[PDB]
Amino acid sequence: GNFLKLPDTDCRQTPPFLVLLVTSSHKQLAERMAIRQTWGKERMVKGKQLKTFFLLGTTSSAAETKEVDQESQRHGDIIQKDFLDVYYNLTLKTMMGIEWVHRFCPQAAFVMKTDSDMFINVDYLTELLLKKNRTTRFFTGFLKLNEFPIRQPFSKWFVSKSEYPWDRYPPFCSGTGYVFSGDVASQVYNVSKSVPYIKLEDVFVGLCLERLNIRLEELHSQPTFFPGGLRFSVCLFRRIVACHFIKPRTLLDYWQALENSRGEDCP
């Protein structure tokens, strides 16, 4: 597949239950370390294997290139291909992750694509997945069902009419954190080259899923994915899956809060 880096893992031997694919740019080492030390730490979650990998492209900076080469040697959890790692190449990054699942870990029961500014509660996500009885053609997150493309030309999410020419986006889930049954990876990889390209990765996956006739589903009767962010509380964060707008220092503090309060009761 032309990968420059591949994690030292053998999903055929020990099929993981949940694989996290985490986006971050080259310079965001602090984010990756905070995640490695918090919700990204590999472990058994109620007897289910969690695995964690970081998606990276390449950069012009020789310094950053060397940093990441050393980081990969030290941690062995980086998936990398040769594409310029910039915001408007996130679609390639996401497709890299999906291609990796397809080529090297099709045995994963579930895959979560997520970002580096996030708190993820893997314990509660795993509980909710074990309760869904949905093991195939499954895709969930924060559902965005009738979104309109942003035409304000200086907006971070602006797309011109030539980039995306229609009035509404397909159904899709926030790229902040979405989850799917491992089989979906192969399906999306397969239809990817046939679907109109768009620089917003979450919209692009939405296009792929629509072509595949895979409908988006809510994970639970209550909201569990929060792209808008949330006021922090131990009891609230025990019963959510994903929360956005979390910088590394904050992530470490929240993780410590949950450890300090382990084994209290919540209403």
Ligand SMILES: O=c1ccn([C@@H]2O[C@H](COP(=O)(O)OP(=O)(O)O[C@H]3O[C@H](CO)[C@H](O)[C@H](O)[C@H]3F)[C@@H](O)[C@H]2O)c(=O)[nH]1
């Ligand atoms: O060059 C980069 C720049 C950013 N990122 C990572 O991409 C994610 C999203 O970047 P931002 O948090 O700066 O912006 P935003 O929250 O608006 O991104 C949103 O819009 C994007 C459209 O591609 C994605 O869908 C994304 O998941 C979704 F959250 C982050 O994890 C960031 O670390 C990279 O990997 N490489």
Ligand SMILES: *[C@@H]1O[C@H](CO)[C@@H](O[C@@H]2O[C@H](CO)[C@@H](O)[C@H](O)[C@H]2NC(C)=O)[C@H](O)[C@H]1NC(C)=O
């Ligand atoms: C997305 O990454 C691709 C691949 O690195 C970029 O395309 C290359 O652009 C460089 C200059 O940045 C050229 O030297 C190469 O010839 C291009 N090759 C390919 C594969 O097209 C592309 O510019 C990046 N996208 C953005 C928006 O920066």
Ligand SMILES: *[C@@H]1O[C@H](CO[C@@H]2O[C@@H](C)[C@@H](O)[C@@H](O)[C@@H]2O)[C@@H](O)[C@H](O)[C@H]1NC(C)=O
């Ligand atoms: C999933 O199923 C749970 C118990 O499942 C048993 O086997 C499944 C496959 C069904 O046939 C079910 O009728 C059986 O009792 C349920 O307790 C649980 O609520 C289900 N999850 C859902 C629907 O959210």
Ligand SMILES: [Mn+2]
């Ligand atoms: Mn973000």
